[PDB]
Design a binder for this molecule. Structure first.
Ligand SMILES: *[C@@H]1O[C@H](CO)[C@@H](O[C@@H]2O[C@H](CO)[C@@H](O[C@@H]3O[C@H](CO[C@H]4O[C@H](CO)[C@@H](O)[C@H](O)[C@@H]4O)[C@@H](O)[C@H](O[C@H]4O[C@H](CO)[C@@H](O)[C@H](O)[C@@H]4O)[C@@H]3O)[C@H](O)[C@H]2NC(C)=O)[C@H](O)[C@H]1NC(C)=O
Ligand SMILES: *[C@@H]1O[C@H](CO)[C@@H](O[C@@H]2O[C@H](CO)[C@@H](O[C@@H]3O[C@H](CO[C@H]4O[C@H](CO)[C@@H](O)[C@H](O)[C@@H]4O)[C@@H](O)[C@H](O[C@H]4O[C@H](CO)[C@@H](O)[C@H](O)[C@@H]4O)[C@@H]3O)[C@H](O)[C@H]2NC(C)=O)[C@H](O)[C@H]1NC(C)=O
Ligand SMILES: *[C@@H]1O[C@H](CO)[C@@H](O[C@@H]2O[C@H](CO)[C@@H](O[C@@H]3O[C@H](CO[C@H]4O[C@H](CO)[C@@H](O)[C@H](O)[C@@H]4O)[C@@H](O)[C@H](O[C@H]4O[C@H](CO)[C@@H](O)[C@H](O)[C@@H]4O)[C@@H]3O)[C@H](O)[C@H]2NC(C)=O)[C@H](O)[C@H]1NC(C)=O
Ligand SMILES: *[C@@H]1O[C@H](CO)[C@@H](O[C@@H]2O[C@H](CO)[C@@H](O[C@@H]3O[C@H](CO[C@H]4O[C@H](CO)[C@@H](O)[C@H](O)[C@@H]4O)[C@@H](O)[C@H](O[C@H]4O[C@H](CO)[C@@H](O)[C@H](O)[C@@H]4O)[C@@H]3O)[C@H](O)[C@H]2NC(C)=O)[C@H](O)[C@H]1NC(C)=O
Ligand SMILES: *[C@@H]1O[C@H](CO)[C@@H](O[C@@H]2O[C@H](CO)[C@@H](O[C@@H]3O[C@H](CO[C@H]4O[C@H](CO)[C@@H](O)[C@H](O)[C@@H]4O)[C@@H](O)[C@H](O[C@H]4O[C@H](CO)[C@@H](O)[C@H](O)[C@@H]4O)[C@@H]3O)[C@H](O)[C@H]2NC(C)=O)[C@H](O)[C@H]1NC(C)=O
Ligand SMILES: *[C@@H]1O[C@H](CO)[C@@H](O)[C@H](O)[C@H]1NC(C)=O
Ligand SMILES: *[C@@H]1O[C@H](CO)[C@@H](O)[C@H](O)[C@H]1NC(C)=O
Ligand SMILES: *[C@@H]1O[C@H](CO)[C@@H](O)[C@H](O)[C@H]1NC(C)=O
Ligand SMILES: *[C@@H]1O[C@H](CO)[C@@H](O)[C@H](O)[C@H]1NC(C)=O
Ligand SMILES: NCCc1c[nH]cn1
Ligand SMILES: [Cl-]
Ligand SMILES: [Cl-]
Ligand SMILES: [Cl-]
Ligand SMILES: [Cl-]
Ligand SMILES: [Cl-]
Lengths: 334, 334, 334, 334, 334
C-alpha cells in the first residue's frame, strides 16, 4: 500500500547484490525449473533444414539474496530490473537465429516472491536447426528437437529440470501446421559431458508427419495421366507414322516439362527422394513406349503380323508393368 | 514561460520516482486506455500467413506520482524522458517482427497532464500472424486479428479498455489493399486466464474479401479457352489422324504448361484449393477428349457408323458436361 | 584558437541545459527550416509499392540557450554532442524502413552559430510507400511523395517551412532512374488536424513517367509476330489439315508460354493492367483464327466454294480487325 | 614495462580531453592521410547497380593533445579507447549499407605514437552504388568508384590525402572476380563545393571488364543453332507441307522458350541491351524463314517453277543475310 | 562458500584494472591458445562463394592482474564481466557476416583460475568466404578455410597457438553436409607480415568432396535419354518425312527446355562448367542428327540407295560417337 516502503525494500534487496555471482555461489547447485508455452510454429523449412518456433520461456529459481519480509505479496517488477539481477545463462543448443520481442517494451517478466524465489519469463522466436531425412519425401516423418543448456555453469553450479513434469510444455495441441501434423512431443532431462565438464540438458522433441494430399493431387496424378496418354498410342494404327511419333515425343516433352517445373517448385534438396524415383519411373515408361513404337515401325514392313502381335502385347504389358511399379512404390514407401 | 521553473517542476516529478513500480502499486489496478490510428496495411502474405501493419499506438493512464501544479499546460516532453517513466508492458500476442521507427528520432511521444495523466504514443510496424483458410482461394474471405495484452501484470495490476469505444481505432476506411477490401472491423475487450492468472486482452479484427477479377482474367479464361480448343477436334474429320492427335496432345501440353506456371506463380500453399480443383477439372476434360478421339480412331475401321455416332455424341456432350462442371463450381464456391 | 577557452564555453552552454524542453518552451513556437539534398533514388518497386531514397536532410532552428559570445566563428561540433541537445522530433509519415548511415561514424552533423542557431544534418535512406495506379501500366505516370511531420509537438510548439523557398530540395536533376523520368517535383507546406491537434507538414512530390521502349521491344513485338504467324495459316491450302492444325495450335502454345513467362517476369500486381488486356486480345485473336479454320474444315466437304470464300474473307478481315484493336488500344492508353 | 606508469600516462592524456573539438581547433586544418587494403570484392550486382567491398580502411592524423613522453614505444591500445578520442567524420558518399565487423570484438585499431600521431583502422564491408551502362551488355566495361568525404568538417577544418601516393590502396591485384577483370584502378584527391562550403574528397576508381565466354557458350550458340535449324527447312521438298510447317513453327517455339528463359536468367534491367537485340534479330530471321515458306506453299500450285526459284534463292540468301547481321553486330559492339 | 569474501576478492581484482592495456604490457607477448568446437555447418553456397559455420570458439590466456588467492576454486563468472576485462582482438580474416548468439543471454563464458588464467568462450555463427573452382562442377572438390588473426596487436604483443595440438578443433566428424563430405581438416599456425608488422595467424582448412548421385539421376540421365530418342529416328523409314522431322525438332525442343530449366535450377555460376559442356555435347549431337536426316531427305529423291547407306551409317556411327564422347567426358573429369 505504501509505495515508499516497497521502494525501500527493493533498494535493500538490490543493495550489495552481486550479479557476477550465482545464488549459493560455492555451494550446492541452484536448481532451475523451466516451462515452455508454445505460441506457434511459424514454418518448417527443408531447404534450410530448420524450423521457426515462438514460445514463452519461463525459468524458476531461488536466490536467497532477494528474500524479503513484511510484504505479503508477489512483486511483479518492471522488466528493466532484470538487468540488475543474476539470471541463468540458458541458451538453445541447436538454434541459428533467436531474439526476444521488444515491442512495445522488451517481452520480459520478473516476479519476485517472499521466499527469494524468482520467476523470469521471456518471449523468444528461435529458428532451431532440424536435420531431416528426406529419402521418403513427401511420405516422410521427421523428428525436430529443441535443446536447452547452460552455457558456462556446469552441473556443479546449476541444474535444470522440467517444472511440472510432462505438463511442463503447453500449447502443443494448438499448433497449426499447414503441411505437418504433430504426432507426439517428448520431454527429456539429462547431463552431457564435454571437455570443460558436465552440463545440464533439457530436450523438447516433436514428431511431425507430412500431409500427402497436396502432392497426390498435384505431383503424381499428372504423371499418371501422361503415362496413360503415352499408352494411348498403342491403339492408334501403325500406318499413321506421324500421329504416333508426334504423340510419343509430345508425351515425352510434357513429362520433361512436368519434371523440370516440379523440381523448380519442390525444395532444392540435393539427393534422391521418393518423388524423384516416381518421376524417373514415369519418364522411363514413356521412353520405353516410344522406343517400342519405333521398333514396331522398323519391323512392320518385314512382317506386319509380328508388328501387330508386338502392338497387342504392349497393350497388355505396359499397364500391367506400370501397375506393378506403382504397387512396389506404394508398398515400399508406406 | 519560465523554462527554469518548468525544469524544476519536472525534476521534482522525477526525483524519487521508482520506475520499477506501477502506479498505485499494491492498490487498485491502473486502467490503460488504448487507441490505434492505422497508417496502412503494407502487405498480406499467404505464403507466410501474416500481414504487415503500420500504426500509431497510443496508451493513456494516470500516474499520481507525476501530478504537477502551477503549470496550466500539458507538457509535451522529449521522447527520451520515456526511458525514465513507468510504461505498461503492452505487447502484441500474435506478432512476429515488430519495431518502432527511429528516424529522425525514435517515433515516440510523451505528454503529461496536470492531474497525473500520461499519454504515450508509438509508431509501430508489426508483422502479425494470421492463419488463413485457403480452401476457397481465390474466392476466400479471411479474418485477421491483432491481439494486445499485458505481459507481466495481471488483471489485479492493470486493466485495458478501448479509449473512445468503437471510435478507438481509426484509419480503417483509408486502407488501400490492392487485392483485398476491408468488409468490417471489430473491437473486443476481455480477460484471458493462464496458469499465472488473468490478463487483460484487446482484439482488433478485420474481415478481408479477396478481389477476383485478376484471377478470372489470368487464371480461368485461358483454361476455358484451351478446353474449347480441345473440343474443336470433335468437328475435325477422323480420317485426318495426324491433325486430331496433334491438336489433342498440344492442348494437353498447353494445359500442363499453364498448370505448372500458375503453380509457380501462385503462393506456396501445401493443400487443395478451389483454383487447383478447377485446373484439375479442365485437365481431366482435355484428357477425356483425347481418350475419346483414341477410341473413335480405334473403332473407326470396324464400323465407321458407330465412330461417327460417338463423334457427334461427343460434340453434344463435352460442352454440356463442362457447362455443368462450371455451374457446380460457381455455385459451390459462391 | 585557445581550445581550453572553447571547451569552457561549450561546457557552460551545456551546463544546466535541459534536453526535455524545446526552445522557447511555453512561448512562441520554434520555426524549423528544412532542406533536402537528394543523393539518389535507389529503386522504385511496383510489387512493394514503395521507393528507396537517400538524402542529406538538414534542419535549421534557433535555441537561445545555445547562444555564445566571444568566439567569432561557427562551431562545428562532433556529432556525439547531438545526443546532448534538443532536436526536433521530425519523422516521415509514409516511410516503412528508414535508417541513418553510421560508417565510419554516424552520418550526423551539428553546427552552432553565435546567435544560438543550430544546424543539424543527417544522411538518411528511407523506403517510402507510394501507392501506384497501375491500370495504365506500363504507360503510367506515378506521383510519389515524401511526407515530413512533427511526431509529438503541435503547431503551438513547432512550425515547419522549406528553407530557401522552392530551392529547398536539390539534386533532383542528378537522379538517374533507369526506368522512370522525373517530370516535375513540388514542395508543399501545410497543417494537418488530428484528434490531438494540428501538426506541421511538409511534402516533397515527384512525378515519374515510365519509359516504354523495353516493353515495346520485349512484350508487344513477340505478341504481334505470333499473331501474324497465326494469320499465316489462312494462305495455307485447306487440304493440308495437319499443317494448319499444327500451325494454329502451336501459335496458341507459343502465346500461352509468352503470357506465362511475361507474367512471371512482370511484377506481381494482383489486378488488371493494360499489358494484360493486350495479351488477352492477342490470345483471343489466335483463338478465333483457329476456330475459323475449324469451321472452314468442317464445311469444306459440303460446299468448298463457301469454304474458300470464308478463307479469303478471313485473310482480309483478321489483319483489319487486329489493326482496329491496336488503334483502339494505342489511342485509349496514350 | 611498468603497467601502472603507462596507465597513469594514458589517464593523463585522456584527462581533460574534449572529444567534441578537432585537433588544432580554431587553427590550421588537421590533415588526415588514408590507406585502403582491399580484402575482397564480394559481388557486383547489375540488378541493384552496386558492388560489395570489404576493406581495411586506415586513417592517420596528429592530435597534440595525445602527445606523451617517457615511453619510447607506440601504444597499441584497446579498441574501446576509440570511444574516448576524436576521430574524423569520414564517410562514403555513394554507399548504401556499410557496417564494421564486430566478431569477436569490433574490428577497430587505435595506435598512438609519441609525437601525438594517431593511427585508426577499421574493417568495413560497404555496399557502394555503381551506375552501369548496360547498352553493350554483356560486352560492357564498367567504372565503379568509392567516394570518401568528410561529413561535417569543411576544408578549413580537415584535409584529406592518400597516404603513400599511388601505393595508398593495396590488395587490388589479389581480387578474384568470377565475372569481371580489373583493368585499372585510380586514386583521385580534390575538393567539392556544396552550399555549406568546400569539402575534401578522395576517390578510388576501378575499371571492370566483363568476361564473355559464358555468354557465348550459353546464350548465343543455342540461338545460332536454332536459326540454322530454321534454315534446314529450305532443303526440304515443298510437297511435305506438314513437315515444313512443323519444323518452322517448332523453331519459332524453341526461339520463344530460349528468349523467355534467358530473360528470366538475365538480370532484370528495364531497357535495351545488345543481347536482346541479337535475340530479336534471330527471332526475326526464323520468322522470315517461316513467312518465306508460307509464300512458297501458296504460290506452289499456280507456278511450281517460281516456287522452286524462291526456295533456292532463300537457301542462298538466308545464311548470307544472317552472316551480314552477325558481322555488323560483332563489329559494332566490339 | 562465503559470497561476501568472493565479492571482495573480485572487486579487489577489478580495482585499478586497466582494460586498455594487454597483459604484460610492454613486456613479452601474451600467448593465446585457441580451440574450436564446431556445432554444425549450415550451408555451402556456390552462388555467394561462402559457407556458414556455427562453433564454440574458446581462447585461453594468462593475465596476472586477475590472479587471486585464498579461493581454491575456479570462478565461472557472469558473461557481463567480460566487458570489464582485456580480451584479445581476435577476428576472422575471411568472414563476411558474423555474430555472437544472444538468447537468452549473450552466449559468452568467462572462467578465471587462481594463477591468473582466463578462459573465454563464445558461440559464433560466421559466414566465411570460400573461393571455389567450379570448373569441374559437379565433380568438384573444394578447400574452404577459416582464418584467425589478431587485429591490432602484432607478434611482439600476442602469439596464437592451437591449444591441444591437432585435437584443438573437435566436432568435425559429426558435421552433416547433405551435399558434401568432409575428406580432411588441417590446422596451421604461422605469422603473416603486413606493412604494420607481423601478425599471428591460425588456419582451419576443410576439404570437401561433392556428392554426385543426385546430378547423375536428375541432370545426366534425361540428357542421355533424349539423345537416344534423337537416334531412334534413324530406324524410322525415311519416306515418312513428317514423322522424322517432328521427332528431330521435338527432341531439339526438349533439349532446349532441359538446358534452360537446369540452368535456372543450378547455381548462378557465370563461367564454363563440366555439366554445361555435357549439355552442349548432347545438344550438338541432336542437332547433328537432325542435320543428317535433312541431308538424307534432300539426297533421297536423286539416289535412294545413297540415302539408305547414309541412314545405316548414321545408325552405326551416332551411338559410337556418343559413347566415345561419354568415355572422354567421364575419364577427363574422374
Ligand atoms: C527424436 O530423437 C531423439 C533422439 O535423437 C529422441 O530423444 C530420446 O528420447 C528417449 C525417450 O523417448 C530418451 O531416452 C530416455 O533418456 C533418459 C535420460 O537418460 C540420461 O539420464 C539417465 C539417468 O536419468 C542416465 O542413466 C542415462 O545414461 C542418460 O544420461 C532416461 O532416463 C530414460 O530411461 C527411462 O526409460 C527407459 C525406457 O525408455 C527405462 O529403461 C529407464 O529405466 C527409464 O525409466 C530414457 O532412456 C533419449 O535419451 C533421447 N535421446 C536424446 C539424444 O535426447 C526423441 O524422443 C525423438 N522424438 C520423439 C518425438 O520421440
Ligand atoms: C475473427 O474471429 C474472431 C474469433 O476467432 C472474432 O472475435 C470474436 O468476436 C466476437 C464479437 O463479434 C466476440 O464476442 C463478444 O465477446 C465479448 C467479450 O466476452 C468476454 O468477456 C466478457 C466480459 O466482458 C465475458 O462475460 C465473456 O464470457 C467473455 O470472456 C462479449 O462482451 C460480447 O457480448 C456481446 O454479445 C452477447 C451475445 O453473444 C451479448 O449478450 C452482449 O450484450 C454483447 O452484445 C460478445 O460475446 C468474441 O469474444 C471474439 N472472439 C475472440 C476469441 O476474441 C472476430 O470478430 C472475427 N473478425 C471479425 C471482423 O468479425
Ligand atoms: C501528388 O499528389 C499530391 C496530392 O495527393 C499533390 O499535393 C498537392 O499539391 C498541391 C500543389 O500542387 C497543393 O495545393 C496547394 O496547397 C497549399 C496548402 O494549402 C493548405 O494551406 C492553405 C494555407 O496556407 C489553406 O488555405 C488550405 O486550405 C490548405 O490547408 C496552398 O497554399 C496552395 O494554394 C496556392 O496555390 C494555388 C494554386 O495551386 C492558388 O490558387 C492559391 O491562391 C495559392 O497561391 C495550393 O492549394 C495541395 O495541397 C497538395 N495536396 C496534398 C494532399 O498534399 C502533389 O502536388 C502531387 N505531385 C505533384 C508532383 O504534383
Ligand atoms: C571513372 O570515372 C571517374 C569520373 O566519374 C574518373 O575519375 C576522374 O579521374 C581523373 C583522372 O584520371 C580526374 O582528373 C584529375 O583531377 C585532379 C583533381 O582536380 C581537382 O583539383 C585540381 C587542383 O589539384 C583542380 O585544378 C581541379 O579543378 C579539380 O578541383 C587533377 O589534379 C588532375 O590533373 C592532373 O592530371 C591531368 C591528367 O589526368 C593533367 O593534365 C594535369 O596537368 C594534372 O597533372 C586530373 O584532372 C577526375 O577529376 C576524376 N573525376 C572525378 C569525378 O573524380 C575515373 O578515373 C574513372 N575510372 C577509371 C578507372 O579511370
Ligand atoms: C587449402 O589450401 C591451403 C593453402 O591455400 C592449405 O594450407 C596450407 O597447408 C600446408 C599444410 O598442409 C601448410 O604447409 C605447412 O606450413 C607450416 C607453416 O609454415 C609457416 O610458418 C613457418 C614457421 O613455423 C615458416 O617457416 C613458413 O615460411 C610459413 O610462414 C610449415 O611449418 C609446414 O612445414 C612443415 O611440414 C613440412 C611437410 O608438410 C616439412 O617439409 C617442413 O620441414 C615442416 O616440418 C608446412 O610447410 C601451408 O603453409 C598452408 N598454406 C596456407 C596459405 O595456409 C590447406 O592445407 C588446404 N586445405 C587442406 C584441407 O589441405
Ligand atoms: C512509507 O514508507 C516510508 C519509508 O519507510 C516512510 O517514510 C513513510 O512515512 C511511509 N508512509 C506512510 C504513510 O507512513
Ligand atoms: C524561474 O524559475 C526559477 C526556478 O524556480 C527562479 O529561480 C526564477 O526566479 C524564475 N524566473 C522568474 C522571472 O521569476
Ligand atoms: C585559454 O583559456 C583558459 C580558460 O579561460 C585559460 O585558463 C588559458 O590561460 C587560456 N590560454 C591562453 C594561452 O590564453
Ligand atoms: C565473509 O567475508 C566478509 C568479507 O571479507 C567478512 O566480513 C565475513 O565475516 C565473512 N564471513 C564469515 C562467516 O567469516
Ligand atoms: N558532404 C557534406 C554533406 C553534404 C553534402 N551535400 C549536402 N550535405
Ligand atoms: Cl521484435
Ligand atoms: Cl524505421
Ligand atoms: Cl550504413
Ligand atoms: Cl560482422
Ligand atoms: Cl541469436
Amino acid at each position: 500500500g505504501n509505495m515508499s516502503f516497497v521502494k525501500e525494500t527493493v533498494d535493500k534487496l538490490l543493495k550489495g547484490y552481486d550479479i557476477r555471482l550465482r545464488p549459493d555461489f560455492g555451494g550446492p547447485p541452484v536448481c532451475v525449473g523451466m516451462n515452455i508455452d508454445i505460441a506457434s510454429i511459424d514454418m518448417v523449412s527443408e531447404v534450410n533444414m530448420d524450423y521457426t518456433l515462438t514460445m514463452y520461456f519461463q525459468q524458476y529459481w531461488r536466490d536467497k539474496r532477494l528474500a524479503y519480509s513484511g510484504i505479503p505479496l508477489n512483486l511483479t517488477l518492471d522488466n528493466r530490473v532484470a538487468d540488475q539481477l543474476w539470471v541463468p545463462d540458458t541458451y538453445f543448443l541447436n538454434d541459428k537465429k533467436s531474439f526476444v520481442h521488444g515491442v512495445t517494451v522488451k517481452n520480459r517478466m520478473i516476479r519476485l516472491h517472499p521466499d527469494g524465489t524468482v520467476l523470469y519469463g521471456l518471449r523468444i522466436t528461435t529458428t532451431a536447426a532440424c536435420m531431416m531425412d528426406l529419402r521418403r519425401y513427401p511420405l516422410d516423418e521427421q523428428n525436430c528437437t529443441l535443446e536447452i543448456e547452460s552455457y558456462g555453469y556446469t552441473t556443479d553450479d546449476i541444474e535444470f529440470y522440467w517444472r511440472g513434469g510432462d505438463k511442463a510444455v503447453t500449447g502443443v495441441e494448438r499448433i497449426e501446421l499447414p503441411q505437418f501434423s504433430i504426432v507426439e512431443h517428448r520431454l527429456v532431462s539429462r547431463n552431457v559431458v564435454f571437455a570443460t565438464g558436465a552440463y545440464p540438458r533439457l530436450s523438447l522433441s516433436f514428431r511431425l508427419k507430412r500431409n500427402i494430399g497436396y502432392f497426390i493431387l498435384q505431383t503424381y496424378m499428372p504423371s499418371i495421366l501422361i503415362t496413360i496418354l503415352s499408352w494411348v498410342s498403342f491403339w492408334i494404327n501403325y500406318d499413321a507414322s506421324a500421329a504416333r511419333v508426334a504423340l510419343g515425343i509430345t508425351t515425352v516433352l510434357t513429362m520433361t516439362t512436368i519434371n523440370t517445373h516440379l523440381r523448380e517448385t519442390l525444395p532444392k534438396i540435393p539427393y534422391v527422394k521418393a518423388i524423384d524415383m516416381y518421376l524417373m519411373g514415369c519418364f522411363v515408361f514413356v521412353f520405353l513406349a516410344l522406343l517400342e513404337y519405333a521398333f514396331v515401325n522398323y519391323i512392320f514392313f518385314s512382317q506386319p503380323a509380328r508388328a501387330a502381335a508386338i502392338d497387342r502385347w504392349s497393350r497388355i504389358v505396359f499397364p500391367f508393368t506400370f501397375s506393378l511399379f506403382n504397387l512396389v512404390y506404394w508398398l515400399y514407401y508406406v
